[PDB]
Amino acid sequence: GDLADRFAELERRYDARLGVYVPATGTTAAIEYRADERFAFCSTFKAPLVAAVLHQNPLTHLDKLITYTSDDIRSISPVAQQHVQTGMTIGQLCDAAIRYSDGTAANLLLADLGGPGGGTAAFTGYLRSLGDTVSRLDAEEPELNRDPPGDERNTTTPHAIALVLQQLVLGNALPPDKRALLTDWMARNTTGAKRIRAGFPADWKVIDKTGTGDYGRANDIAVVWSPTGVPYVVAVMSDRAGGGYDAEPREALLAEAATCVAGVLA
């Protein structure tokens, strides 16, 4: 259709590979572009990671204090690295993992799921439990960013991650109370002003989880509400693998992709 051609023009203009998935609703068709193609998760996994922790524990667990050392700061950790002396509660870790993409928080929450591979296996299994047979997490931060194009490790697809997020925020994967916490953390995200948010009019609400990696990898997964309160899930994934491991990620690609989506859903 014409929208596919426009996504293709966007890819050509940015010298990038773009993936888009907006699940169909009772009133709207799905928007799909390279939606069954694999893209690195990057920091986007930190949102479903928080859902896994929520899922597996009573809410009182959020008050559990976790201590760690400066040697645990092995990845970009804007919150955790300033709380080595105090520790952080599981809830604070969930907050940081989503709103600041905190990698140490992510690793600690992975550990909290238990089992081999520092909780990476358990994370993947959580996604399996939501019907996702595609996504896989194989390493902790930062080593999960190291995989070259073509390697299936630490990848998802726009389709798979969109349907995960759909079930988590809009569906019944979580009880409404836990769902509200996940939603609130994504709502107050600090990292996403220049991506999906930048492509929707100000009277639309946007909650989201960003990620950035090597090979120009830039993702955003969002739930948006129209001015009338109609929700949609918008997953946008990109890389610029053609330019090499140090290709510049382009936030503006995601904003423009989201603009194209907002045009269809207005």
Q: Which residue do the tokens 């009573």 mark?
A: 58
Largest CA distance in the chain: 56
Q: Report the nearest approach of ligand 4D6 to the CB of residue 210 (Å).
A: 3
Check if 256 is active-site: no
Q: Report the nearest approach of Na ion to the CB of residue 70 (Å).
A: 7
| 166 touches 233 (CB < 8 A) | yes
**Residue 128 φ then ψ, to 5°:** -55, -40
Choose the one of Na ion, ligand 4D6, none that binds residue 84, judging by a C-beta under 5 to 8 angstroms depending on kind: Na ion
The residue count for binding ligand 4D6 (CB under 6 A) is 15
Q: Report the nearest approach of Na ion to the CB of residue 85 (Å).
A: 5
Q: What angle do CA 200, 177, 185 make, to 5 degrees?
A: 40
Q: Which residues are annotated as a binding site for substrate?
A: 101, 210-212
Q: What is the DSSP letter of 152?
A: -
**Looking at 62, 75, 123, 208, which residue binds ligand 4D6 (CB under 6 A)?**
75
Bridge-based pairing state of the strands 65-66 and 88-89: antiparallel
Counting contacts by CB under 6 A, is residue 239 touching ligand 4D6? no
Counting contacts by CB under 6 A, is residue 141 touching ligand 4D6? yes
Q: How far apart are CA 68 and CA 74, in angstroms?
A: 12
Q: Report the nearest approach of ligand 4D6 to the CB of residue 26 (Å).
A: 32
**Looking at 204, 210, 250, 255, which residue binds ligand 4D6 (CB under 6 A)?**
210
**Strand pairing partners for 34?**
none
- Residue 103 or residue 119: which is nearer to Na ion going by CB? 103
Counting contacts by CB under 6 A, is residue 124 touching ligand 4D6? no
CA 264 to chain centroid: 23
Candidates 11, 32, 140, 141; catalytic one = 141
Check if 141 is active-site: yes
Tell me the three-class secondary structure of 13-34, residue by residue. HHCCEEEEEECCCCCCCCEEEC
| Helix or strand holding residue 66 (H, E) | strand 65-66
**Looking at 92, 101, 107, 238, which residue binds ligand 4D6 (CB under 6 A)?**
101
Counting contacts by CB under 6 A, is residue 212 touching ligand 4D6? yes
Counting contacts by CB under 6 A, is residue 107 touching ligand 4D6? no
Q: Report the nearest approach of ligand 4D6 to the CB of residue 102 (Å).
A: 8
By CB under 5 A, name the binding residues for Na ion.
84
Say what the alpha-carbon torsion angle 105, 144, 78, 113 is, to the nearest 10 degrees: 0
Q: Which residue is nearest to ligand 4D6 (CB)?
A: 43
**Looking at 213, 221, 232, 255, which residue binds ligand 4D6 (CB under 6 A)?**
213
C-alpha distances out from residue 68 to 91, 109, 113, 116, 123, Å: 15, 12, 17, 19, 21
Residues 41-60 that bind ligand 4D6 (CB under 6 A): 42-43
| 258 touches 266 (CB < 8 A) | no
**Interacting residues with ligand 4D6 (CB under 6 A):** 42-43, 75-76, 101, 103, 141-142, 145, 191, 210-214
So which residues are the catalytic ones?
A: 43, 141
